[PDB]
Amino acid sequence: NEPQCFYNESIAFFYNRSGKHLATEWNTVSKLVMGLGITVCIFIMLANLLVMVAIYVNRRFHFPIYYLMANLAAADFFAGLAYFYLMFNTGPNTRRLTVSTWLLRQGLIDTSLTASVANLLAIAIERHITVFRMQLHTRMSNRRVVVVIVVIWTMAIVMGAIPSVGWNCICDIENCSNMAPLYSDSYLVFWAIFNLVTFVVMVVLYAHIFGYVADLEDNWETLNDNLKVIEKADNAAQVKDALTKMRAAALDAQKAMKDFRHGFDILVGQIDDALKLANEGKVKEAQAAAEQLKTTRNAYIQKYLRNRDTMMSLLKTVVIVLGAFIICWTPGLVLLLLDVCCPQCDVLAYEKFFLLLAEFNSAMNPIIYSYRDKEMSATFRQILG
Numbered sequence: 402n403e404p405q406c407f408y409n410e411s412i413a414f415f416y417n418r419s420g421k422h423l424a425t426e427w428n429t430v431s432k433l434v435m436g437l438g439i440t441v442c443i444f445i446m447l448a449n450l451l452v453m454v455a456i457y458v459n460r461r462f463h464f465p466i467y468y469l470m471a472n473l474a475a476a477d478f479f480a481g482l483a484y485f486y487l488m489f490n491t492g493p494n495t496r497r498l499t500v501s502t503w504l505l506r507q508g509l510i511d512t513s514l515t516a517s518v519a520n521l522l523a524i525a526i527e528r529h530i531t532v533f534r535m536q537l538h539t540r541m542s543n544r545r546v547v548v549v550i551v552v553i554w555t556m557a558i559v560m561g562a563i564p565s566v567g568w569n570c571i572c573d574i575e576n577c578s579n580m581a582p583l584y585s586d587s588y589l590v591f592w593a594i595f596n597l598v599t600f601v602v603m604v605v606l607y608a609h610i611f612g613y614v615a616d617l618e619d620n621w622e623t624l625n626d627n628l629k630v631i632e633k634a635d636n637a638a639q640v641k642d643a644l645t646k647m648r649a650a651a652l653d654a655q656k657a658m659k660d661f662r663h664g665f666d667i668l669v670g671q672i673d674d675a676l677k678l679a680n681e682g683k684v685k686e687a688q689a690a691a692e693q694l695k696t697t698r699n700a701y702i703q704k705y706l707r708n709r710d711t712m713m714s715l716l717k718t719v720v721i722v723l724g725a726f727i728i729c730w731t732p733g734l735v736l737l738l739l740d741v742c743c744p745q746c747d748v749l750a751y752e753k754f755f756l757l758l759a760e761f762n763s764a765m766n767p768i769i770y771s772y773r774d775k776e777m778s779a780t781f782r783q784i785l786g
């Protein structure tokens with residue numbers, strides 16, 4: 402005969418087989434990890450709730466990008482509830498957990514991660530669309546955001562159910578991991594490489610945005626700097642090379658909504674016709690058409706500038722939220738890889754430290770929006786009254 406793959410005393414037989422703790426009495430550091438854990442959880446459930454109400458009541462925050470930020474806060478709010486149930490069942494209370502309740506606390510944490518991972522992935526796509534135009538907002542996108550929120554939460558529920566739908570070492574006791582005694586090694590290798598490849602493709606998304614913005618500002622720098630060169634009363638040869646640098650920078654910036662798309666070729670024509678005047682010998686007409694180009698770039702600087710500064714201010718804030726997410730979650734996910742692919746090389750003692758490091762990030766997001774966003778910082782003072 403064999404014991405049940407579903408008993409209450411079963412936490413002890415999974416935890417003893419693998420290189421993991423099983424406590425009976427209340428330790429000194431176990432009380433502080435729980436004490437600090439709940440204190441952080443209450444703050445997450447308050448700070449992320451504050452920013453969710455702030456987007457809901459303020460008129461300026463009724464845009465597809467700010468609705469996704471509220472869902473990211475809702476994912477952290479869910480994480481606050483997930484870590485709360487975890488910290489209440491740590492140390493001597495771990496023995497009290499059954500096979501079903503163990504998968505529940507571990508499942509809620511796996512659901513909360515992919516909820517924030519898919520949210521940041523959706524924000525990365527949202528910023529990748531707005532930058533290929535100026536702004537992306539019609540009422541149809543607001544209705545589409547509701548559908549996107551469903552996709553994010555559906556994928557979170559499914560990813561947090563995959564190990565609880567057969568992919569576990571429950572009745573495959575030989576293939577159990579040292580960190581999670583009820584989770585399979587094949588799942589943890591898959592889960593860690595899935596979340597890390599998502600971080601890499603997200604970095605590529607923003608690197609493609611920042612790289613393109615760099616080429617725009619560079620070609621706009623080449624535009625304004627060589628404009629000053631032409632203006633200077635020199636020889637015909639001095640104007641030709643500057644206008645050649647003017648044309649090449651315009652056609653490079655062309656490799657990018659209708660109003661801005663047509664705007665580039667208007668500038669190419671004014672440069673190419675000014676070049677023809679200079680090739681004839683008319684140095685005057687080449688410099689006269691250059692000031693005509695100055696009155697055209699100053700017109701488009703009113704329609705795109707003041708608006709791109711508000712876009713880049715929010716773009717940087719998003720990368721800080723994503724940056725902090727990678728720096729804290731990567732050591733914990735690398736720890737999962739070293740758990741099954743590195744046996745006897747290093748002890749997995751720093752498991753309480755990396756757990757709290759990822760937990761603090763759920764509280765870091767409203768702190769980031771408080772000092773970066775100018776309009777949101779004034780909405781926070783209104784909540785106290």
Ligand SMILES: COC(=O)c1cn(C[C@H](CC2Cc3ccccc3C2)[C@H](O)c2cc(OC)c(C)c(OC)c2)cc1CC(=O)O
Pocket residue numbers: 434490491492495507510511514580581592730732733734736737752753755756759
């Ligand atoms: C205070 O809790 C612990 O020290 C602890 C550490 N672990 C191990 C592990 C924690 C380590 C593995 C990991 C992964 C990401 C971030 C940190 C850590 C540490 C945890 O199961 C886990 C696995 C897990 O992967 C399925 C994920 C995503 C987690 O979210 C943070 C947490 C379990 C516990 C609770 C206990 O056994 O009483």
